[PDB]
Design a protein around this ligand. Structure first.
Ligand SMILES: O[C@@H]1[C@@H](O)[C@H](O)OC[C@H]1O
Ligand SMILES: [Ca+2]
Length: 329
């Protein structure tokens, strides 16, 4: 636990907050300010039960904790494990999208509605029909549509689904079979329903071939995020056991997306999760690691670092402890 100490010393970001553990940061600019919707790690395994909302009033501002806005006890369909959330706005309402586990052990995604971005949010009684697995991200397209992206394998259970239907004997593909991708569905105007069944998002390599299941350096693992820049859509995501946030580009929110490279090098703690958000004069990467907790994977803190799109559209790799650091993974 001294190799950990080198990384803390050269970390490029300090924890945005330290009075509670935070993870899975989803950043949005709502109503002139930056709101962050992270998960809330509890210091008792990932047994989170509630969400807070954080805010930066302006660039460089101190980070405000706007308090708890949703608890699993008010989510009647869910039993436990309030994981990586996201938010969207429409018609003056704010919607909090969140993955949670039913009593029978299956993850699904539910939504909660509020009249302000800081809530409080009133959760719908049933989960969103046609969703499953975890890690929602809702893209507010320039054209006025909203798209829901979701999925995570391993613990996230996506591997048990094909064409939106569960099977106990559905497993993660192996070898030369195409790796599973995240799901995408346009949202209905009423925002709490999908407008359509979800579709597979396909990630391609440099030769236009879907990433293979045995390509763990690049294949989708969990936590999709999409942002728009310079006329293209950027899909970014965690690769899980290779500990990277990678990204790919498409001219459509539906893909297919062509793999581009690594956006974030490995962080301390097993998981890595992020969002990418434009705030006034600067794009930022929001991410998390386990430095604050001394390396405990399930006790995380969110961070932010400035991100840069080059003229050719690529995004240079961000190294959370410096390019020189010995990677934690
Ligand atoms: O949603 C997150 C998930 O992607 C990860 O596997 O573990 C922590 C969760 O909050
Ligand atoms: Ca997310």
């Amino acid at each position: 636990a001294a190799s950990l100490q080198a990384l803390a010393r050269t970390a490029i970001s300090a924890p945005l907050v330290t009075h509670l553990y935070t993870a899975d940061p989803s950043a949005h600019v709502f109503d002139g300010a930056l709101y962050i919707y992270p998960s809330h790690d509890l210091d008792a395994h990932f047994d989170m039960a509630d969400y807070h909302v954080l805010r930066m009033a302006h660039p460089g501002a101190a980070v405000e904790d706007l308090g708890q806005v949703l608890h699993v006890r008010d989510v009647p369909w869910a039993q436990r494990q309030m994981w990586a959330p996201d938010a969207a706005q429409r018609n003056g309402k704010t919607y909090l999208y969140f993955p949670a586990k039913r009593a029978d052990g299956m993850f699904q995604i539910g939504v909660a509605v509020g009249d302000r971005p800081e809530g409080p949010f009133v959760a719908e009684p049933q989960p969103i029909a046609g969703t499953y697995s975890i890690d929602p991200a809702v893209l507010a397209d320039d054209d006025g549509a909203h798209y829901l992206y979701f999925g995570g394998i391993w613990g996230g259970q996506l591997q048990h689904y094909r064409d939106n239907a569960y099977a106990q004997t559905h497993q993660e593909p192996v070898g030369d079979a195409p790796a599973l991708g995240p799901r995408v569905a346009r949202l209905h105007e009423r925002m709490i329903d999908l407008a359509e069944p979800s579709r597979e998002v396909v990630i391609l390599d440099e030769h236009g071939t879907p990433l293979r299941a045995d390509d763990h350096a690049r294949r989708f693992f969990e936590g999709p995020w999409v942002h728009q820049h310079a006329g293209r859509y950027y899909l970014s995501y965690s690769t899980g056991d290779t500990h990277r946030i990678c990204y790919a580009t498409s001219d459509s929110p539906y893909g297919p997306f062509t793999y581009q490279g690594v956006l974030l090098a490995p962080v301390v703690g097993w998981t890595t999760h992020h969002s990418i958000c434009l705030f006034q004069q600067q794009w930022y990467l929001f991410y998390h690691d386990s430095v604050l907790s001394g390396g405990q994977t399930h006790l995380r803190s969110i961070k932010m670092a400035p991100l840069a799109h080059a003229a050719d559209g690529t995004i240079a790799t961000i190294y959370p402890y410096g390019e020189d650091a010995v990677s934690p993974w």
